[PDB]
C-alpha cells in the first residue's frame, strides 16, 4: 500500500498505487469506476477493506 | 429474471402514512441472485 | 459629469453583481473546452466493434495474434477520436484568435 | 463433466452450473483424447490465467 | 465564472490527467494580467 505496483484482482490487471479507501461501498459492491470508465476502487477478496 | 438468474432487490423504510404509496424517493439494494434457470410466466404471494 | 460617471459605474456593479448574464461569451468557451475534453475522456469507453473497450480485458483473454484483430479496432477508433478533437480544437482556436 | 457414464440427447441437452471452485483447464487442454477444443471469446492457453 | 480545476497542484480533471489529457498553465499569472491591466 501507498507504493507503485502492477496490480491484479480477479484478472482485473493493471498498474497503480493501492491505498485504503474511505468510499462507503454498500456491501454488495466490489468495484468503483471513474468517469473515464476505468476502475478507481476495488474490494479485496481476502480482506474486505 | 435475467438469462436464468432470478434476482431480488429490496428496501425496508420507516414511514408515517394512512393513505397511498409514499410519494418520495429511494433505491432498492440487491439482496440475492439465484441461478434458477426456470421459466416464470406468473406469480402469487403467501399470507399467514 | 463626475457624479454621472460614478453613478454609471455603480450601475455596472449592480448589473454584474445582482445577476449573472453578460459573461456567457467567456463562459461558453470554458464550457466548450471542458465539454470537448470530457467527450474525449468518454470516447475511451467506446468499443469500436471490439469485444471490450478495455485493453487488459482483451490482453488477459486473447493471445498475441487474436488480440490484434481487436486491438487495431480500438487503435483505429482512438486515433480518429484524437484527430476529431484536434480538428475541433484547431478550428475553435481560430475563433479565439 | 467429461467423466459421466452417460450423456444427454441434443433435443433435451443437459446444463450443469459451475461455481465456487478452482479451474485447472490444462487438464482438459493437455488431454490428447479431445478431437477439438476450440475457444471463441478467449484463447485456450489463457484459461488457467 | 465557475471552472472545474485549472492545473492548480494535483473530478473531471483527475480523470483527464489519468488519461494524459494535461492542462498547462498560462505564461502570465492572473496577477501579471491584473498588473498590465
Ligand atoms: C508534493 O507532495 C508532497 C507530499 O509528499 C506535498 O507536501 C505536503 O504538503 C502539505 C501542504 O503544505 C503538508 O500538509 C504535508 O505535510 C506535506 N507532506 C510532505 C511529506 O511534504 C507537497 O505539497 C506537494 N507539492 C505539490 C506542488 O503538489
Ligand atoms: C482467506 O484466507 C484467510 C486465511 O488464510 C481468511 O482470513 C479469509 O477469511 C479468507 N477469505 C475469505 C473471503 O474468507
Ligand atoms: C414459458 O412458457 C410459456 C407457456 O408455454 C410460454 O408462453 C412462454 O413463451 C415461455 N417463455 C420462455 C422464455 O420460454
GROMACS .gro file of C-alpha atoms and ligand atoms in nm:
model
  336
    1UNK     CA    1   0.000   0.000   0.000
    2UNK     CA    2   0.097   0.362  -0.078
    3UNK     CA    3   0.357   0.211  -0.328
    4UNK     CA    4   0.355   0.170  -0.711
    5UNK     CA    5   0.292  -0.188  -0.839
    6UNK     CA    6   0.144  -0.395  -1.120
    7UNK     CA    7  -0.188  -0.495  -0.957
    8UNK     CA    8  -0.429  -0.778  -1.034
    9UNK     CA    9  -0.765  -0.860  -0.872
   10UNK     CA   10  -0.982  -1.139  -1.030
   11UNK     CA   11  -0.800  -1.085  -1.368
   12UNK     CA   12  -0.856  -0.704  -1.345
   13UNK     CA   13  -0.484  -0.649  -1.409
   14UNK     CA   14  -0.325  -0.302  -1.427
   15UNK     CA   15  -0.065  -0.063  -1.277
   16UNK     CA   16  -0.103   0.181  -0.985
   17UNK     CA   17  -0.073   0.278  -0.618
   18UNK     CA   18  -0.313   0.099  -0.380
   19UNK     CA   19  -0.444   0.291  -0.074
   20UNK     CA   20  -0.716   0.227   0.191
   21UNK     CA   21  -1.044   0.383   0.075
   22UNK     CA   22  -1.298   0.576   0.283
   23UNK     CA   23  -1.556   0.514  -0.001
   24UNK     CA   24  -1.855   0.364   0.190
   25UNK     CA   25  -1.918   0.075  -0.053
   26UNK     CA   26  -2.261  -0.075   0.005
   27UNK     CA   27  -2.199  -0.443   0.098
   28UNK     CA   28  -2.294  -0.585  -0.245
   29UNK     CA   29  -2.030  -0.372  -0.436
   30UNK     CA   30  -1.680  -0.497  -0.540
   31UNK     CA   31  -1.572  -0.220  -0.786
   32UNK     CA   32  -1.579   0.158  -0.824
   33UNK     CA   33  -1.538   0.322  -1.160
   34UNK     CA   34  -1.409   0.665  -1.259
   35UNK     CA   35  -1.594   0.890  -1.511
   36UNK     CA   36  -1.345   0.763  -1.775
   37UNK     CA   37  -1.493   0.405  -1.747
   38UNK     CA   38  -1.170   0.295  -1.579
   39UNK     CA   39  -1.170   0.137  -1.232
   40UNK     CA   40  -1.067   0.355  -0.934
   41UNK     CA   41  -1.160   0.133  -0.634
   42UNK     CA   42  -1.176  -0.242  -0.552
   43UNK     CA   43  -1.289  -0.459  -0.261
   44UNK     CA   44  -1.022  -0.721  -0.191
   45UNK     CA   45  -1.130  -1.087  -0.156
   46UNK     CA   46  -0.916  -1.197   0.141
   47UNK     CA   47  -0.964  -0.861   0.314
   48UNK     CA   48  -1.294  -0.673   0.282
   49UNK     CA   49  -1.127  -0.330   0.311
   50UNK     CA   50  -3.538  -1.296  -1.413
   51UNK     CA   51  -3.234  -1.225  -1.639
   52UNK     CA   52  -3.077  -1.501  -1.852
   53UNK     CA   53  -3.168  -1.773  -1.596
   54UNK     CA   54  -3.069  -1.566  -1.289
   55UNK     CA   55  -3.363  -1.468  -1.070
   56UNK     CA   56  -3.253  -1.157  -0.881
   57UNK     CA   57  -3.414  -0.982  -0.586
   58UNK     CA   58  -3.354  -0.620  -0.491
   59UNK     CA   59  -3.531  -0.472  -0.183
   60UNK     CA   60  -3.582  -0.180   0.059
   61UNK     CA   61  -3.745  -0.161   0.402
   62UNK     CA   62  -3.811   0.200   0.515
   63UNK     CA   63  -3.993   0.362   0.808
   64UNK     CA   64  -4.297   0.583   0.727
   65UNK     CA   65  -4.598   0.752   0.897
   66UNK     CA   66  -4.886   0.747   0.639
   67UNK     CA   67  -5.252   0.640   0.626
   68UNK     CA   68  -5.328   0.675   0.253
   69UNK     CA   69  -5.137   0.563  -0.063
   70UNK     CA   70  -4.789   0.454  -0.182
   71UNK     CA   71  -4.544   0.703  -0.019
   72UNK     CA   72  -4.462   0.991  -0.253
   73UNK     CA   73  -4.084   1.030  -0.221
   74UNK     CA   74  -3.759   0.869  -0.340
   75UNK     CA   75  -3.523   0.579  -0.251
   76UNK     CA   76  -3.334   0.284  -0.409
   77UNK     CA   77  -3.365  -0.095  -0.356
   78UNK     CA   78  -3.034  -0.274  -0.280
   79UNK     CA   79  -2.964  -0.616  -0.445
   80UNK     CA   80  -3.044  -0.878  -0.179
   81UNK     CA   81  -2.991  -1.209  -0.370
   82UNK     CA   82  -2.913  -1.371  -0.709
   83UNK     CA   83  -3.022  -1.734  -0.767
   84UNK     CA   84  -2.914  -1.933  -1.082
   85UNK     CA   85  -3.259  -2.096  -1.102
   86UNK     CA   86  -3.297  -2.119  -1.485
   87UNK     CA   87  -3.678  -2.186  -1.473
   88UNK     CA   88  -3.943  -2.012  -1.685
   89UNK     CA   89  -4.162  -1.769  -1.479
   90UNK     CA   90  -4.487  -1.680  -1.661
   91UNK     CA   91  -4.685  -1.591  -1.344
   92UNK     CA   92  -4.658  -1.541  -0.969
   93UNK     CA   93  -4.855  -1.531  -0.640
   94UNK     CA   94  -4.778  -1.415  -0.281
   95UNK     CA   95  -4.818  -1.602   0.057
   96UNK     CA   96  -5.031  -1.494   0.361
   97UNK     CA   97  -5.040  -1.624   0.724
   98UNK     CA   98  -2.021   6.460  -1.518
   99UNK     CA   99  -1.819   6.303  -1.235
  100UNK     CA  100  -2.140   6.222  -1.043
  101UNK     CA  101  -2.287   6.072  -1.361
  102UNK     CA  102  -1.977   5.861  -1.430
  103UNK     CA  103  -1.967   5.740  -1.067
  104UNK     CA  104  -2.342   5.662  -1.090
  105UNK     CA  105  -2.292   5.466  -1.414
  106UNK     CA  106  -2.006   5.267  -1.251
  107UNK     CA  107  -2.247   5.193  -0.962
  108UNK     CA  108  -2.496   5.060  -1.223
  109UNK     CA  109  -2.228   4.825  -1.367
  110UNK     CA  110  -2.153   4.687  -1.017
  111UNK     CA  111  -2.525   4.636  -0.953
  112UNK     CA  112  -2.579   4.491  -1.306
  113UNK     CA  113  -2.300   4.231  -1.276
  114UNK     CA  114  -2.347   4.161  -0.901
  115UNK     CA  115  -2.732   4.129  -0.882
  116UNK     CA  116  -2.744   3.866  -1.166
  117UNK     CA  117  -2.515   3.659  -1.395
  118UNK     CA  118  -2.592   3.734  -1.763
  119UNK     CA  119  -2.331   3.928  -1.966
  120UNK     CA  120  -2.038   3.682  -1.912
  121UNK     CA  121  -2.193   3.399  -2.122
  122UNK     CA  122  -1.945   3.480  -2.407
  123UNK     CA  123  -1.649   3.388  -2.184
  124UNK     CA  124  -1.834   3.107  -2.007
  125UNK     CA  125  -1.928   2.922  -2.329
  126UNK     CA  126  -1.554   2.892  -2.415
  127UNK     CA  127  -1.457   2.744  -2.075
  128UNK     CA  128  -1.765   2.522  -2.120
  129UNK     CA  129  -1.667   2.407  -2.473
  130UNK     CA  130  -1.301   2.348  -2.371
  131UNK     CA  131  -1.421   2.123  -2.089
  132UNK     CA  132  -1.704   1.954  -2.287
  133UNK     CA  133  -1.474   1.857  -2.576
  134UNK     CA  134  -1.217   1.711  -2.329
  135UNK     CA  135  -1.493   1.536  -2.132
  136UNK     CA  136  -1.611   1.387  -2.466
  137UNK     CA  137  -1.256   1.270  -2.542
  138UNK     CA  138  -1.240   1.110  -2.190
  139UNK     CA  139  -1.577   0.943  -2.262
  140UNK     CA  140  -1.458   0.812  -2.601
  141UNK     CA  141  -1.224   0.574  -2.414
  142UNK     CA  142  -1.541   0.383  -2.309
  143UNK     CA  143  -1.633   0.324  -2.680
  144UNK     CA  144  -1.597  -0.031  -2.824
  145UNK     CA  145  -1.530   0.049  -3.192
  146UNK     CA  146  -1.669  -0.303  -3.262
  147UNK     CA  147  -1.418  -0.488  -3.037
  148UNK     CA  148  -1.513  -0.747  -2.765
  149UNK     CA  149  -1.442  -0.477  -2.497
  150UNK     CA  150  -1.343  -0.108  -2.493
  151UNK     CA  151  -1.085  -0.204  -2.222
  152UNK     CA  152  -0.733  -0.313  -2.319
  153UNK     CA  153  -0.638  -0.557  -2.037
  154UNK     CA  154  -0.977  -0.734  -2.082
  155UNK     CA  155  -0.856  -0.821  -2.433
  156UNK     CA  156  -0.492  -0.893  -2.343
  157UNK     CA  157  -0.580  -1.120  -2.046
  158UNK     CA  158  -0.816  -1.325  -2.265
  159UNK     CA  159  -0.666  -1.348  -2.614
  160UNK     CA  160  -0.315  -1.448  -2.732
  161UNK     CA  161  -0.093  -1.216  -2.947
  162UNK     CA  162  -0.247  -1.258  -3.295
  163UNK     CA  163  -0.617  -1.275  -3.194
  164UNK     CA  164  -0.576  -0.973  -2.968
  165UNK     CA  165  -0.453  -0.759  -3.262
  166UNK     CA  166  -0.777  -0.812  -3.463
  167UNK     CA  167  -0.949  -0.644  -3.160
  168UNK     CA  168  -0.666  -0.402  -3.065
  169UNK     CA  169  -0.632  -0.240  -3.411
  170UNK     CA  170  -1.004  -0.158  -3.388
  171UNK     CA  171  -0.952   0.029  -3.059
  172UNK     CA  172  -0.641   0.195  -3.207
  173UNK     CA  173  -0.824   0.299  -3.526
  174UNK     CA  174  -1.113   0.442  -3.321
  175UNK     CA  175  -0.891   0.616  -3.062
  176UNK     CA  176  -0.664   0.768  -3.326
  177UNK     CA  177  -0.961   0.906  -3.522
  178UNK     CA  178  -1.111   1.024  -3.190
  179UNK     CA  179  -0.797   1.233  -3.118
  180UNK     CA  180  -0.788   1.364  -3.480
  181UNK     CA  181  -1.153   1.469  -3.444
  182UNK     CA  182  -1.086   1.655  -3.117
  183UNK     CA  183  -0.775   1.821  -3.267
  184UNK     CA  184  -0.972   1.929  -3.576
  185UNK     CA  185  -1.235   2.079  -3.344
  186UNK     CA  186  -0.964   2.244  -3.130
  187UNK     CA  187  -0.768   2.396  -3.419
  188UNK     CA  188  -1.100   2.521  -3.567
  189UNK     CA  189  -1.208   2.657  -3.228
  190UNK     CA  190  -0.869   2.822  -3.171
  191UNK     CA  191  -0.922   3.031  -3.491
  192UNK     CA  192  -1.232   3.192  -3.340
  193UNK     CA  193  -1.046   3.277  -3.017
  194UNK     CA  194  -0.760   3.420  -3.222
  195UNK     CA  195  -1.847  -3.310  -1.682
  196UNK     CA  196  -1.619  -3.528  -1.902
  197UNK     CA  197  -1.631  -3.849  -1.691
  198UNK     CA  198  -2.015  -3.900  -1.658
  199UNK     CA  199  -2.116  -4.258  -1.757
  200UNK     CA  200  -2.394  -4.135  -1.992
  201UNK     CA  201  -2.453  -3.808  -2.180
  202UNK     CA  202  -2.786  -3.646  -2.293
  203UNK     CA  203  -2.978  -3.614  -2.625
  204UNK     CA  204  -2.937  -3.282  -2.808
  205UNK     CA  205  -3.317  -3.216  -2.828
  206UNK     CA  206  -3.301  -3.216  -2.439
  207UNK     CA  207  -2.937  -3.111  -2.368
  208UNK     CA  208  -2.812  -3.118  -2.007
  209UNK     CA  209  -2.672  -2.793  -1.849
  210UNK     CA  210  -2.458  -2.817  -1.525
  211UNK     CA  211  -2.378  -2.494  -1.332
  212UNK     CA  212  -2.020  -2.436  -1.213
  213UNK     CA  213  -1.931  -2.203  -0.924
  214UNK     CA  214  -1.720  -2.158  -0.608
  215UNK     CA  215  -1.429  -2.367  -0.744
  216UNK     CA  216  -1.076  -2.383  -0.894
  217UNK     CA  217  -1.031  -2.445  -1.267
  218UNK     CA  218  -0.717  -2.621  -1.398
  219UNK     CA  219  -0.817  -2.618  -1.767
  220UNK     CA  220  -0.471  -2.763  -1.850
  221UNK     CA  221  -0.633  -3.098  -1.751
  222UNK     CA  222  -0.877  -3.069  -2.041
  223UNK     CA  223  -0.637  -2.889  -2.275
  224UNK     CA  224  -0.340  -3.127  -2.225
  225UNK     CA  225  -0.573  -3.432  -2.262
  226UNK     CA  226  -0.490  -3.582  -2.604
  227UNK     CA  227  -0.834  -3.755  -2.628
  228UNK     CA  228  -1.021  -3.444  -2.747
  229UNK     CA  229  -1.062  -3.423  -3.127
  230UNK     CA  230  -1.144  -3.048  -3.079
  231UNK     CA  231  -1.100  -2.788  -2.801
  232UNK     CA  232  -1.194  -2.452  -2.965
  233UNK     CA  233  -1.228  -2.123  -2.774
  234UNK     CA  234  -1.413  -1.817  -2.906
  235UNK     CA  235  -1.405  -1.527  -2.655
  236UNK     CA  236  -1.073  -1.643  -2.500
  237UNK     CA  237  -0.764  -1.830  -2.627
  238UNK     CA  238  -0.721  -2.174  -2.459
  239UNK     CA  239  -0.373  -2.102  -2.316
  240UNK     CA  240  -0.526  -1.815  -2.106
  241UNK     CA  241  -0.794  -2.031  -1.936
  242UNK     CA  242  -0.563  -2.103  -1.634
  243UNK     CA  243  -0.476  -1.729  -1.602
  244UNK     CA  244  -1.731   3.231  -1.371
  245UNK     CA  245  -1.716   2.874  -1.229
  246UNK     CA  246  -1.446   2.639  -1.366
  247UNK     CA  247  -1.370   2.276  -1.269
  248UNK     CA  248  -0.993   2.279  -1.183
  249UNK     CA  249  -0.717   2.478  -1.375
  250UNK     CA  250  -0.378   2.294  -1.320
  251UNK     CA  251  -0.351   2.401  -0.954
  252UNK     CA  252  -0.133   2.132  -0.783
  253UNK     CA  253  -0.266   1.774  -0.819
  254UNK     CA  254  -1.331   1.532  -1.057
  255UNK     CA  255  -1.327   1.598  -1.439
  256UNK     CA  256  -0.956   1.691  -1.433
  257UNK     CA  257  -0.844   1.396  -1.218
  258UNK     CA  258  -0.988   1.176  -1.499
  259UNK     CA  259  -0.833   1.398  -1.774
  260UNK     CA  260  -0.489   1.368  -1.600
  261UNK     CA  261  -0.536   0.989  -1.557
  262UNK     CA  262  -0.571   0.972  -1.941
  263UNK     CA  263  -0.279   1.207  -2.027
  264UNK     CA  264  -0.516   1.497  -2.107
  265UNK     CA  265  -0.292   1.754  -1.935
  266UNK     CA  266  -0.385   2.124  -1.889
  267UNK     CA  267  -0.082   2.355  -1.897
  268UNK     CA  268  -0.085   2.695  -1.716
  269UNK     CA  269  -0.073   3.034  -1.894
  270UNK     CA  270   0.263   3.213  -1.915
  271UNK     CA  271   0.118   3.522  -1.746
  272UNK     CA  272  -0.024   3.485  -1.395
  273UNK     CA  273  -0.361   3.638  -1.310
  274UNK     CA  274  -0.166   3.894  -1.104
  275UNK     CA  275   0.052   3.983  -1.408
  276UNK     CA  276  -0.265   4.020  -1.617
  277UNK     CA  277  -0.410   4.243  -1.343
  278UNK     CA  278  -0.083   4.448  -1.328
  279UNK     CA  279  -0.078   4.501  -1.707
  280UNK     CA  280  -0.447   4.599  -1.679
  281LIG     C1  281   0.416   1.725  -0.332
  281LIG     O1  282   0.387   1.620  -0.240
  281LIG     C2  283   0.425   1.649  -0.105
  281LIG     C3  284   0.396   1.525  -0.023
  281LIG     O2  285   0.496   1.426  -0.043
  281LIG     C4  286   0.350   1.772  -0.054
  281LIG     O3  287   0.397   1.805   0.076
  281LIG     C5  288   0.287   1.815   0.168
  281LIG     O4  289   0.231   1.947   0.172
  281LIG     C6  290   0.117   1.964   0.264
  281LIG     C7  291   0.062   2.106   0.249
  281LIG     O5  292   0.167   2.202   0.270
  281LIG     C8  293   0.161   1.928   0.407
  281LIG     O6  294   0.045   1.924   0.495
  281LIG     C9  295   0.223   1.788   0.410
  281LIG     O7  296   0.270   1.760   0.545
  281LIG    C10  297   0.338   1.777   0.308
  281LIG     N1  298   0.393   1.641   0.310
  281LIG    C11  299   0.521   1.617   0.287
  281LIG    C12  300   0.569   1.473   0.314
  281LIG     O8  301   0.599   1.705   0.249
  281LIG    C13  302   0.371   1.890  -0.149
  281LIG     O9  303   0.289   1.999  -0.110
  281LIG    C14  304   0.339   1.851  -0.292
  281LIG     N2  305   0.368   1.961  -0.383
  281LIG    C15  306   0.286   2.000  -0.481
  281LIG    C16  307   0.333   2.115  -0.564
  281LIG    O10  308   0.179   1.944  -0.502
  282LIG     C1  309  -0.876  -1.611   0.304
  282LIG     O1  310  -0.798  -1.685   0.389
  282LIG     C2  311  -0.772  -1.627   0.517
  282LIG     C3  312  -0.690  -1.732   0.588
  282LIG     O2  313  -0.592  -1.787   0.501
  282LIG     C4  314  -0.901  -1.591   0.591
  282LIG     O3  315  -0.868  -1.495   0.690
  282LIG     C5  316  -1.007  -1.528   0.500
  282LIG     O4  317  -1.134  -1.536   0.564
  282LIG     C6  318  -1.015  -1.597   0.363
  282LIG     N1  319  -1.102  -1.522   0.274
  282LIG     C7  320  -1.235  -1.516   0.288
  282LIG     C8  321  -1.309  -1.434   0.187
  282LIG     O5  322  -1.293  -1.575   0.379
  283LIG     C1  323  -4.263  -2.006  -2.091
  283LIG     O1  324  -4.372  -2.099  -2.106
  283LIG     C2  325  -4.498  -2.040  -2.158
  283LIG     C3  326  -4.608  -2.147  -2.163
  283LIG     O2  327  -4.576  -2.247  -2.262
  283LIG     C4  328  -4.472  -1.974  -2.295
  283LIG     O3  329  -4.590  -1.899  -2.333
  283LIG     C5  330  -4.354  -1.876  -2.291
  283LIG     O4  331  -4.321  -1.832  -2.426
  283LIG     C6  332  -4.231  -1.942  -2.226
  283LIG     N1  333  -4.123  -1.846  -2.208
  283LIG     C7  334  -3.996  -1.875  -2.233
  283LIG     C8  335  -3.896  -1.759  -2.217
  283LIG     O5  336  -3.961  -1.988  -2.267
   0.00000   0.00000   0.00000
